[PDB]
C-alpha cells in the first residue's frame, strides 16, 4: 500500500541522516569509502563482504534497508571486517578497531535514542508480510 510505502520512506529518512552523521565524524573518515585496492591489494581476497558508508548510502536508495535490524547487519560487517582485517597488537591495528567499534556502538546508541521501537517492530511486520 501507499501507507507502508510511506513507512519505508520514513525509514529510508532516518537511516541517511543516522549514515550522514557516522560519515561527518573525523574518527570514521576511513569507513567513508570502500579500500582503494593500490594501497590494498590483499583486502578483497581476505574481506569477502567489504562494507563502507558510501555503500551504505547506496543500499538506502536502492531501497535494500526494509528494517533497522538490517542497517544494523551492514554496520556490524563494518567492524567485523576491521576486526578481521586489522587483528594485530601495533598501534595503527589497534586505532582502525577502536574506531570501527566506535562506529559500531554511535550507530547504535543514536539508533537506541532516536528510533522509536513501534516503528522499527512496523517495519519488521511489513516486511515480513511478502
Ligand atoms: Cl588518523
Known amino acids: 500500500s501507499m501507507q507502508e510505502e510511506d513507512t519505508f520512506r520514513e525509514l529510508r529518512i532516518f537511516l541517511r541522516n543516522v549514515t550522514h552523521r557516522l560519515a561527518i565524524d573525523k574518527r570514521f573518515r576511513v569507513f567513508t569509502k570502500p579500500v582503494d585496492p593500490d594501497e590494498v591489494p ?54 582502525i578497531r577502536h574506531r570501527a567499534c566506535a562506529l559500531r556502538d554511535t550507530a547504535y546508541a543514536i539508533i537506541k535514542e532516536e528510533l522509536d521501537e513501534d516503528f522499527e517492530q512496523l517495519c519488521e511486520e511489513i516486511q515480513e508480510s511478502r
Open 42 to 95: 590483499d583486502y578483497v581476497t581476505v574481506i569477502k563482504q567489504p562494507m563502507d558508508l558510501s555503500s551504505v548510502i547506496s543500499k538506502i536508495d536502492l531501497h535494500k534497508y526494509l528494517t533497522v535490524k538490517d542497517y544494523l547487519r551492514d554496520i556490524d560487517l563494518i567492524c567485523s571486517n576491521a576486526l578481521e582485517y586489522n587483528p594485530d597488537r601495533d598501534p595503527g591495528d589497534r586505532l
